[PDB]
Amino acid sequence: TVAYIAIGSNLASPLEQVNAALKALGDIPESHILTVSSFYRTPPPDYLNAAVALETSLAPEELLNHTQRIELQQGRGGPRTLDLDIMLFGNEVINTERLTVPHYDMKNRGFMLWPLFEIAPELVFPDGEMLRQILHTRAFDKLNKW
Ligand SMILES: Nc1ncnc2c1ncn2[C@@H]1O[C@H](COP(=O)(O)CP(=O)(O)OP(=O)(O)O)[C@@H](O)[C@H]1O
Ligand SMILES: Nc1nc2ncc(CO)nc2c(=O)[nH]1
Ligand SMILES: [Cl-]
Ligand SMILES: [Mg+2]
Ligand SMILES: [Mg+2]
Numbered sequence: 001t002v003a004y005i006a007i008g009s010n011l012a013s014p015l016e017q018v019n020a021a022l023k024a025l026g027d028i029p030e031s032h033i034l035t036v037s038s039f040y041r042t043p044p045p046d047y048l049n050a051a052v053a054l055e056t057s058l059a060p061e062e063l064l065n066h067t068q069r070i071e072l073q074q075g076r077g078g079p080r081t082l083d084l085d086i087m088l089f090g091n092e093v094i095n096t097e098r099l100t101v102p103h104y105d106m107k108n109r110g111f112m113l114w115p116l117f118e119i120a121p122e123l124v125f126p127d128g129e130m131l132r133q134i135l136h137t138r139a140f141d142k143l144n145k146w
Helices: 015-026 060-074 110-119 131-138
Strands: 002-009 031-036 040-042 047-056 076-079 083-089
Touching (some): 002 015, 002 110, 015 031
Antiparallel strands (some): 002 047, 002 083
């Protein structure tokens, strides 16, 4: 299953943070990275944001245990300076105590949507909404690469 994960860091010099995170993402068992977006310096200091397409045989809650582990192990300041958010998990819709998939706010965030669109321009959400339409409709300003 293709999972799309948002990576965010508020570090002033967060490149290494994000590289640490990407390495660990690639080291998730039963998974491998398909594509990584450009890095984007986005208004909140400022964030470094990226999107990752991750092929995985893991159930969504398994994937979350791993991203949460990575936040603790690789976060310069634990989960607060490294944020790994599951945007989409294939076409699954999940509304559990631990997991709301698609991410409950991604449709409001250029810093999630534009990197996603870079790597998955033909993406359609479970409800049938198309990523291109949302960017069209909201007309989010294009982001600036890191
Ligand atoms: N799609 C999703 N991806 C990652 N965590 C999710 C999630 N949906 C729900 N969560 C839950 O979100 C909880 C808190 O994670 P935080 O990283 O502190 C939220 P955040 O990313 O800081 O804010 P945000 O959701 O506005 O982006 C986790 O304990 C987890 O159970
Ligand atoms: N630019 C930017 N702002 C954010 N604000 C809140 C949150 C909460 O996770 N994330 C972000 C983010 O990744 N980028
Ligand atoms: Cl949806
Ligand atoms: Mg977040
Ligand atoms: Mg988070």
